Write a protein that binds this ligand. Structure first.
Ligand SMILES: Cc1ncc(COP(=O)(O)O)c(C=O)c1O
Ligand SMILES: Cc1ncc(COP(=O)(O)O)c(C=O)c1O
Ligand SMILES: [Mg+2]
Ligand SMILES: [Mg+2]
Lengths: 280, 275
């Protein structure tokens, strides 16, 4: 009956990226959520024309302030961030995260959206500001490209990914989920923990599917979050999420972008299709 | 496939009004839709503080242009409009509706969102602009407060609501659904091929925030799925009644919690044909 999640990410009028993926998934899981937008764009940035604007600092401040003063954030237990068009919004979000976490315990999943397949699709000022943002997170979900940028290491293998994670765990970050580390005809996901006394690092090997991956990572993020919110242990929540995503992609015609609307009946799938491999 | 609906209305970060209700409902009905925002507000206007801004004309034009140039609106069959914070967006929408309707067949439902219970909650410039907007709709869905404003007639009874619809029909408005008078009235200009009707709904006490928007999008969804209009209205009002009966005391209806009821097929009320 009250809002449990605050999610700060991008919005597109048509298509499924950022907070618009968030909306479909968290609504379908029936998780009450505040969606604060960082953009109001016609369509994602992969098109030749991208109408609309980033949200202005002063409007973002105004929004956050109104949520606070009207007590619409009083029961937030989860915070998620995603895409930012500008670093000022990132620094402001840091201020907001600090004030949230000073008051109460809130689990912050930072999806450090910067780029993919070795190419950034964010401003350089955002890239730099994201290095500061992640330090406040409870769990981060970079892809390999993101992880490389965040740490300054090459990430072309699981062993490199492990080294890279270690640098971020030393900064205080408790949990790092690395998506789409490369391996022959497959892709590896790595879940790495700062506290390896009480938690076990693991990998999942996923067969590579050819086709358009617009919105894939964002979908994974929100499906994972939703199962975390429901109380599914993290190993299981990861396996469910990547299992669901594989199911969605197997039911997408290859050239088409995944249609999250059409795949609503699959979102809450509980199949855990892959093997959890503990790394030694 | 492709986008079938374009919906232009307000957005709130927390709560369920305007295009945020739209998103939940159309997404649950699995109707592929473009949601162009006219605001980006923290919360609805009923709070003591309302953070955020209306969308700027130049950003609105940029978005519409980008939808067109990337072909993302080429297959739209349905258009809905709702809340606008300023009259410039209304006039620009009118330009976009004209260019849609000149060469494609698109069913435009205009929900002329101005006010309720005899009090407006929109700018007077938006009130004036809405008299122009409605002139391009295939169907409009005023409440009685809205219909009274749009015609300058008192609307305090069905018979007054009938008279008010007639003046708008004489001006070309083809279908008018008047949502609360409690009586709903569906009035047609062409009474040769369609039959005007009313539905009597028992009055429920409580908070109605997002009620009207919820009705609009459930009605549209059923129109889209090919249910005949009279039945689509019955389902929509039937579903809202069910949602309201399950809402406790002072709370606003929680569309997220009620997702399983949105696609309800019950037709709980009686369609009454009038003279
Ligand atoms: C606004 C926006 N554009 C684009 C993307 C990624 O899109 P693309 O890879 O198609 O450029 C995201 C997030 O993943 C986004 O939020
Ligand atoms: C932004 C916005 N605020 C408010 C409302 C209605 O608000 P109120 O709850 O003041 O009646 C609507 C639509 O009905 C809206 O779109
Ligand atoms: Mg990503
Ligand atoms: Mg209304």
């Amino acid at each position: 009956m009250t809002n449990k999640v605050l999610t700060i990410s991008s919005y597109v009028c048509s298509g499924f990226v950022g907070n618009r993926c968030g909306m479909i998934i968290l609504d379908s899981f029936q998780i009450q959520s505040i969606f604060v937008l960082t953009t109001h764009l016609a369509n994602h940035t992969g098109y030749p024309v991208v109408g609309g604007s980033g949200v202005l600092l002063n409007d973002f401040i105004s929004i956050m302030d109104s949520l606070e003063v009207n007590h619409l954030d009083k029961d937030i237990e989860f915070l998620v961030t995603g895409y930012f068009p500008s670093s000022d919004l990132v620094y402001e979000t840091i201020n907001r995260v600090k004030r949230i976490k000073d008051n109460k315990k809130v689990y912050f999943l930072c999806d450090p959206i910067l780029g993919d397949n070795g190419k950034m699709y964010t401003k350089s000022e955002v890239q730099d500001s994201m290095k500061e943002l992640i330090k406040y997170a409870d769990i981060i979900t970079p892809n390999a490209t993101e992880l490389s940028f965040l740490t300054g290491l090459e990430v072309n293998s699981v062993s490199e990914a492990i080294k890279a994670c270690h640098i971020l765990h030393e900064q205080g970050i408790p949990v790092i989920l690395v998506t789409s580390i490369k391996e022959g005809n497959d892709i590896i996901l790595l879940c790495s923990f700062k506290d390896t006394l009480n938690n076990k690092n693991f990998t999942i090997k996923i067969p590579r599917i050819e086709g358009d991956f617009t919105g894939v990572g964002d979908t994974l993020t929100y499906i994972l979050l939703s199962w975390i919110i429901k109380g599914i242990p993290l190993e299981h929540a990861v396996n469910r999420a990547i299992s669901t995503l594989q199911t969605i992609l197997r039911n997408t015609v290859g050239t088409a972008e995944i249609n999250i609307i059409n795949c609503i009946p699959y979102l809450k799938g509980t199949e855990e299709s892959f093997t959890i491999t503990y790394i030694l």
